[PDB]
Ligand SMILES: *[C@@H]1O[C@H](CO)[C@@H](O[C@@H]2O[C@H](CO)[C@@H](O)[C@H](O)[C@H]2NC(C)=O)[C@H](O)[C@H]1NC(C)=O
């Protein structure tokens with residue numbers, strides 16, 4: 001297996017994050033049984049590390065699903081850490097990692113051992129080793145649910161300094177989220193193309209892969225919009241480059 | 251009891267945070283037993299809610315204690331959430347909430363019932379109800395240790411928009427941290443007096459209570475410096491006021 005091995009103390013982390021997230025839910029949706037949510041999740045750990053399907057996590061989703069506030073959904077590609085810091089524990093936006101079912105697994109890794117019943121802490125299959133691995137199937141199911149329950153203004157953060165372009169045509173965003181957006185519940189889609197401070201400007205709005213994305217969205221009938229270096233996020237990037245010209249204050 | 255009751259699922263949260271913090275420790279001190287640390291914590295917990303002293307957490311500290319990087323300590327008053335966001339989970343600085351023994355209790359609340367042996371989820375005493383309550387004794391003990399283990403350049407974030415002044419002469423910093431700083435391993439102390447965007451300039455470096463802080467540190471023999479609205483933190487504050495003139499970019 002060519003991917004990271006199972007996260008140590010997976011269960012405690014999972015249960016801990018689930019318990020803390022509950023406090024964020026409103027009393028009306030605060031009724032979530034974390035132990036049951038974990039039991040539904042661990043079903044993938046009883047299977048062959050190459051035989052886990054997205055549907056296997058259906059129960060898990062049913063037990064953790066909760067609504068997402070309108071205009072608060074934030075999708076992304078190649079900017080995991082920046083999205084989490086910007087979203088700031090749901091205060092600014094609510095990306096998948098800030099939704100219950102995404103929160104419990106964010107950055108974690110897991111899979112059962114090939115021939116044994118125990119968890120494999122050595123490594124886990126990548127999409128290259130096999131398509132139906134536990135992690136990939138998990139995110140496909142979770143991202144599908146996140147897209148379906150999103151509404152209002154849809155925000156997307158992309159990396160304009162990524163060597164392969166801002167929009168990867170084969171990513172989760174392209175294959176599992178865009179196709180599941182409910183047009184009737186969406187006002188418009190707003191893209192944020194962020195560049196590293198001083199970093200390379202590989203692609204900006206309307207260039208390269210960004211043209212492919214815009215064309216797909218408009219063809220699908222969505223009202224579209226793109227912003228290079230959305231100021232609020234730029235300010236956050238600047239926290240680490242305060243003495244750089246890009247970050248000088250008036 | 252005037253303070254909020256013990257946090258729900260206190261144990262799951264505690265162990266969850268503990269498990270996650272380990273990954274952040276260098277292999278050298280990563281040898282931590284979260285369950286044992288929890289048991290040490292309970293020792294102070296299973297006592298009369300108005301009879302818990304700082305020393306009751308000695309064991310807890312011993313099992314969770316670890317070194318703090320030179321020049322990475324960050325003390326503060328009246329800016330808890332801003333300090334946590336700036337510190338960014340130990341990436342920039344390591345405030346008390348980003349040290350193992352502080353991380354597991356951050357924002358939480360706890361106390362045993364006045365009579366029965368169960369935790370009191372209804373309420374917990376404040377300093378007013380009784381001085382020796384579980385939470386205040388915990389933070390006194392933790393502050394003392396954090397302070398004794400800090401070295402190099404000491405940083406302090408103060409809120410210059412606080413009505414009563416930037417430096418509380420009766421807060422944890424003045425009463426439990428400054429007295430426990432080891433001058434032998436400290437090079438200098440640097441203060442950052444932060445003001446709310448647009449917010450009031452109640453006090454700035456060299457004014458009011460700040461004059462008290464400076465004189466106390468200098469009387470103790472420390473090299474001292476103060477900075478108004480330290481740029482990196484100012485930028486972070488700006489993320490939420492991108493269109494305010496204080497936040498306009500060059
Ligand atoms: C946006 O993409 C850039 C380019 O891939 C990322 O920066 C690279 O990060 C890797 C790993 O941290 C380094 O090995 C490279 O040296 C970096 N390259 C450059 C040009 O900076 C950057 O981390 C991405 N931004 C976000 C928020 O994920």
Ligand SMILES: *[C@@H]1O[C@H](CO)[C@@H](O[C@@H]2O[C@H](CO)[C@@H](O)[C@H](O)[C@H]2NC(C)=O)[C@H](O)[C@H]1NC(C)=O
Pocket residue numbers: 328329330331332409410411412413446449450
């Ligand atoms: C710095 O102190 C100020 C003053 O106490 C804090 O601002 C107040 O925050 C409360 C609670 O959110 C508001 O109801 C008041 O309207 C604010 N007053 C003013 C004058 O702004 C501020 O939150 C503190 N800063 C930090 C980072 O904690």
Ligand SMILES: NC(=O)c1ccc[n+]([C@@H]2O[C@H](COP(=O)(O)O)[C@@H](O)[C@H]2O)c1
Pocket residue numbers: 074075076077078095096097102105106107139143146171172173177
């Ligand atoms: N840890 C996560 O939060 C996580 C992981 C994989 C996919 N996703 C979803 O897929 C999209 C792209 O993420 P990838 O980096 O996996 O391509 C995002 O918009 C997100 O909602 C989120």
Ligand SMILES: NC(=O)c1ccc[n+]([C@@H]2O[C@H](COP(=O)(O)O)[C@@H](O)[C@H]2O)c1
Pocket residue numbers: 324325326327328345346347352355356357389393396421422423427
């Ligand atoms: N949750 C916390 O991180 C926490 C709580 C109480 C005291 N403290 C320590 O005491 C000092 C003053 O802050 P407080 O006003 O919260 O007591 C800080 O420098 C800090 O290190 C930290």
